[PDB]
Design a protein around this ligand. Sequence first.
Ligand SMILES: *[C@@H]1O[C@H](CO)[C@@H](O[C@@H]2O[C@H](CO)[C@@H](O[C@@H]3O[C@H](CO[C@H]4O[C@H](CO)[C@@H](O)[C@H](O)[C@@H]4O)[C@@H](O)[C@H](O[C@@H]4O[C@H](CO)[C@@H](O)[C@H](O[C@@H]5O[C@H](CO)[C@@H](O)[C@H](O)[C@@H]5O)[C@@H]4O)[C@@H]3O)[C@H](O)[C@H]2NC(C)=O)[C@H](O)[C@H]1NC(C)=O
Ligand SMILES: *[C@@H]1O[C@H](CO)[C@@H](O[C@@H]2O[C@H](CO)[C@@H](O[C@@H]3O[C@H](CO[C@H]4O[C@H](CO)[C@@H](O)[C@H](O)[C@@H]4O)[C@@H](O)[C@H](O[C@@H]4O[C@H](CO)[C@@H](O)[C@H](O)[C@@H]4O)[C@@H]3O)[C@H](O)[C@H]2NC(C)=O)[C@H](O)[C@H]1NC(C)=O
Lengths: 668, 668
Amino acid sequence: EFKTTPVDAAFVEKQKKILSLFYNVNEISYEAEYYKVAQDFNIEASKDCYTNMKAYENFMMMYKVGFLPKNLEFSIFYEKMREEAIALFKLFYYAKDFECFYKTACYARVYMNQGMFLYAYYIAIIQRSDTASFVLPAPYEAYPQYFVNMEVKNKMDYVKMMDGCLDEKICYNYGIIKENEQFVMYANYSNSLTYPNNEDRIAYLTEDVGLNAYYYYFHSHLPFWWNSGKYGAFKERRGEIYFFFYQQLLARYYMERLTNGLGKIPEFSWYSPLRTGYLPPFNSFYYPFAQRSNDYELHTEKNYEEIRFLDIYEKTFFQYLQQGHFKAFDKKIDLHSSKAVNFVGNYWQTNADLFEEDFLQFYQRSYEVNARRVLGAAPKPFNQYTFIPSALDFYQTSARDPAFYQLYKRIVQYIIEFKQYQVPYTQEALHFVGLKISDVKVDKMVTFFDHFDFDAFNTVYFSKEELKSSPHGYKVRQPRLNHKPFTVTIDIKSDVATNAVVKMFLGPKYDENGFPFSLEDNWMNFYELDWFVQKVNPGQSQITRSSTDFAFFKEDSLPMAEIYKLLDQGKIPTDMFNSSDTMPSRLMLPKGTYDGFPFQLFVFVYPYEPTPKESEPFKAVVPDNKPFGYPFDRPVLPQYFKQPNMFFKKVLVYHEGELFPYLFNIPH
Amino acid sequence: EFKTTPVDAAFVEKQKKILSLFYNVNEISYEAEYYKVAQDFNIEASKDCYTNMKAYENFMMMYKVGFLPKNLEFSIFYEKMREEAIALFKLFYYAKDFECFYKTACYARVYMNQGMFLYAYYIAIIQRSDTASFVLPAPYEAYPQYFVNMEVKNKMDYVKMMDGCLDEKICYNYGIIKENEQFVMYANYSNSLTYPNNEDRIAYLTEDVGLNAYYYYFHSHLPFWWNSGKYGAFKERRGEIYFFFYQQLLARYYMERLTNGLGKIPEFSWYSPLRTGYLPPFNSFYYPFAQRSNDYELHTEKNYEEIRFLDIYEKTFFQYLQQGHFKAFDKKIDLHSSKAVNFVGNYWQTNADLFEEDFLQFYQRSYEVNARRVLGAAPKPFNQYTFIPSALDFYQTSARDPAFYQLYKRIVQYIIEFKQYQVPYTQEALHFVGLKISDVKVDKMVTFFDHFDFDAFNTVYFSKEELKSSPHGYKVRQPRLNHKPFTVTIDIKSDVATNAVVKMFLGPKYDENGFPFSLEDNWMNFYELDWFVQKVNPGQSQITRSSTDFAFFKEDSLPMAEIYKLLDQGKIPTDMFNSSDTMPSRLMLPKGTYDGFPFQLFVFVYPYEPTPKESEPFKAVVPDNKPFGYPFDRPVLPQYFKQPNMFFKKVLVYHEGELFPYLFNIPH
Ligand SMILES: *[C@@H]1O[C@H](CO)[C@@H](O[C@@H]2O[C@H](CO)[C@@H](O[C@@H]3O[C@H](CO[C@H]4O[C@H](CO)[C@@H](O)[C@H](O)[C@@H]4O)[C@@H](O)[C@H](O[C@@H]4O[C@H](CO)[C@@H](O)[C@H](O[C@@H]5O[C@H](CO)[C@@H](O)[C@H](O)[C@@H]5O)[C@@H]4O)[C@@H]3O)[C@H](O)[C@H]2NC(C)=O)[C@H](O)[C@H]1NC(C)=O
Ligand SMILES: *[C@@H]1O[C@H](CO)[C@@H](O[C@@H]2O[C@H](CO)[C@@H](O[C@@H]3O[C@H](CO[C@H]4O[C@H](CO)[C@@H](O)[C@H](O)[C@@H]4O)[C@@H](O)[C@H](O[C@@H]4O[C@H](CO)[C@@H](O)[C@H](O)[C@@H]4O)[C@@H]3O)[C@H](O)[C@H]2NC(C)=O)[C@H](O)[C@H]1NC(C)=O
């Protein structure tokens, strides 16, 4: 069913050790392995478990003081917590070998705030080169409270308090059933009480567990606060990735907007009311998540300083552009080079690369952090360890808030204003001399919703006795967007046998009006679907390529239950190991219409130039010296896009079955 | 009534060809010369008709694509349109000789957007050194849709459709008359229905056709998007010219306010409502001109982005002022010099010189352009080629909108803030050793209204038959301000004998208070009347100087019909030839009162230093190394303006006959 990889026994021991810190994250089991190891791990007397004496002794300074206590909300966006998280990450990452890393994690798993631990631990598994290939459970299994709406969470809690079902038939009518002595709780996406506006049409994409997790993975693969020295040659292209990642996401999101009749992502002002509100159905130990009403005035007393910070952060960018020959933080940088694109993305992110340092420093203030605090609408932190959460406080929940897409669309618009200074590609740079795409055909592209399970066991609490047996079996089931596999068929005539790159993009055909888009106005609204190297023959030849093979999408994560079962076969899911940071397959297509929703497919073929071997942080970084998003990485002169080796096809996206997800969660 | 210039036969042949492109601008005569020459013109095979190969190929690339279609509105304020107009101007300007220039022009006149052609063609004639001396029809005869209120345009349109007057006597009552088999339509200035406020008191200046032409002329003489290197030594003074032009204009305009009981030009804020609306009676046969209501909020969603831009553009300037010295756009600028005045003007106009380049580039955004888009109130353009027009979209309608003077008042003030850095004139720099003005006498200064005709035939369509005879005779009659000629006599006692510069300025004597203006707060409010050099004798002499001779004012343009008759005699009008970019005489004085309105006449005599031997972009450039507006180019210490070689005279400006122009247009 799913791609597997054979895996050896030494691997199985280690993967098991890793996965085991993810069970009942909210409680300590006094008789699990990890607790004994933690009791036995003398942090004081193990300087020699670490590569780096400075990292170690830094941790100890903080530790002898004290860290964020257990059970409070952790967010990387508050300074003191970040600095604690980073100290923990350093320890994890400079652990001499796996056993030392294991012991430290056990230690932290017992003695530290669980959000803080989980955050550094994910990040550590991904970055340590001895853990590179190891698999993680999906964030929704690790943090189910950020992915379950309140309604469902309370239903789960009440079945635990009752220790099961009064009678099946009552519970069935509340969407609660038993399968194989496991509880299944049916969950709707939220109604207009949480999206009090049109943005509620889109709840099935914005609340999707895959899409939210996607963003979390993205953050974990290269956190803003860390340099990218780990990845060598890639360092010089970090800011490029930032733009590309957000341009792609907004392209995807606009496409969902279009199929639900919704139009452009709205623009705002720090000095004006923001139109579209959001009321999160989440809560922390102390606080329900902050709500932002409709027409929320951004410019109130408590935001005045933050807004002045944000306002000048943007205008500083404008001043660079006005000046052409800019220069922040050491060098003079020219706008027509690419040292430039690097700078641009880093600038908007305030990442560690901007300042050319290893880790972000306590006093270095982020644009994104301050925007997130203003848009999140929360009252100010009570003390440094206690803030009032909003959706924008976490990567697991950010994509739920319409303001998220508005903030990032603004940043993307600014970056695009810079792209006006880049030289557009000429005819000769885009022409594949001697080669011509003569036709493109596609299978029916069809979307539908179907059910989806995950274990939400991590936010139910369990007794001392039950913990001895690491208990799960509280499953949430959700209708989720999906599509049928299709094939793309490309017809090629060339003069000569050569290696080629084939790329595919999906973009809109018509605006909200019903007018055709021009390339000049639409290049930013295409997202990449696939990338691959093909060996062409001389003459007439034919390339077929299934959607299940598209380079940039993954299969669904498996639950840990399945992971252990596969592990017992020496098997592992390829997609969870080789590409967690990639968008889920089921969301590759925006919801269609029974009708057939008009979009367009761009197939581009250009020569393969042999670029040697790396090991970069995302699967978006493909073995090619070309810009990411190439040839749609910058403004376009439309007269150059009628190259024989390019082809635009109208495709229609259909939908099958029920149009509305709630029709799948109705009892009788 | 007008000054003539004898003119030879070669000239008349060339002048005629030139003027013939301005006939029936809006349709094509299949039997006219220009048409046959356009058809015979192989643009492809004639690269050698041009000085610049790059310019040639540049235009060709563009022309293979396609230009603004015929009939649509042309405005140089929209990027793609500007780039196309510039390409076509490059073609005109680099034409090897007059023949190639004519052909290109015929070609353009046939295959291109007429507005775009007229724009480019005007400028080309003014700029090409082999055309430097030739004359042009007044802007109101070439673009009468920009100088005719809608009521009049419709009266003409219906007379054409009717093929003349059904009944002379109905027609008469509507201000339509036959004269020498030509139609004369009487025109009122617009009522409170056009300026829904106090600014309607002034409609007779702001709608005036001379004043609007004047502004069109000033642009065409040196367009912001072009280099000034053609004028050599003048390039170092381009910003100085920019200031002076607006300062003079606003000073003249404020005088009209004072005589109509109106006070200071209101100040505004991008983040607040603008009090004074504008409703233009103009349409583009597609959209009517955009209206701006009273108390229109500038800061609404569609303007968020542009206001951000305008806001930093301003604040960047403040930061200059605060820093005294700084690098900007290559340069290191010190606000204590004059390389400063020039920079400051160039900054505010974002002209080509500010970047040290030949033409404005695609991506260098203009403050004035966005200021005008925001104040103009229009919905956003529909596409590249189709915007909704406002008065601020054209040089020929700009002066009609109250907001125009408010916008330039803002810029001029920012320059005055800079001018506080300039070191004030001292006794020794102003005192003319051994010379004294003992008296100034002035004839009665009297304003009045009288009728003025122009041919509006260009916004009337003709049949195939009529076109064969290039037809005109659709004349508009309008009361326009004017004054009676007068003499200034100056009495001078002097010790020795040199050439002197005599300068005359007009300033207000009191504010809207009734309180005497002091020079400290009035130097910006003087407009120059005259400049001339004089041989001074030892002892006592009298300089007599008539208004009809004032260096900065021109006679009225003759209509083409009259130009043609003069050409038939070997003559052209001097002022249309030697000085089209000068303000008309009739507007020399603001409307007085029967009473007599109190102003002051400033008379300055200083030593003449024989210098520059140049080639003039404007007549405002007189052969003197002194600043423009000297000694009122900068902050004054009032106690140095008491030199014997200065005289301030109180004058009173009278008015005669009807005070309101509408009484000139009443039927029986
Ligand atoms: C109702 O509301 C009130 C007020 O909000 C709230 O009171 C607060 O309770 C918390 C704990 O629940 C209090 O915090 C504790 O305070 C003591 C002593 O605090 C003072 O002394 C410190 C040093 O002497 C000084 O540095 C402080 O600034 C303060 O003045 C602390 O000792 C407590 O223990 C720490 O807690 C952390 C664990 O989460 C650790 O960082 C820390 O280190 C650890 O400790 C062990 C020893 O136990 C050590 O061996 C290890 O090395 C380990 O790292 C230590 O355990 C704790 O901070 C807080 O002060 C109260 N507020 C006020 C204003 O008095 C009530 O609890 C609320 N009630 C209810 C029912 O909700
Ligand atoms: C430019 O602007 C000016 C000012 O707005 C405008 O002048 C106005 O013109 C109209 C006609 O064109 C004129 O009124 C005509 O007025 C006369 C004069 O009437 C006088 O005497 C009346 C008593 O006998 C008295 O009641 C009036 O108040 C006034 O003092 C009048 O004879 C006409 O009568 C009517 O004729 C029309 C025909 O359409 C019939 O509908 C109606 O039944 C009457 O018989 C007519 O009203 C008006 O007075 C002028 N306004 C001012 C303020 O002086 C110009 O016409 C305009 N010019 C151009 C070329 O655009």
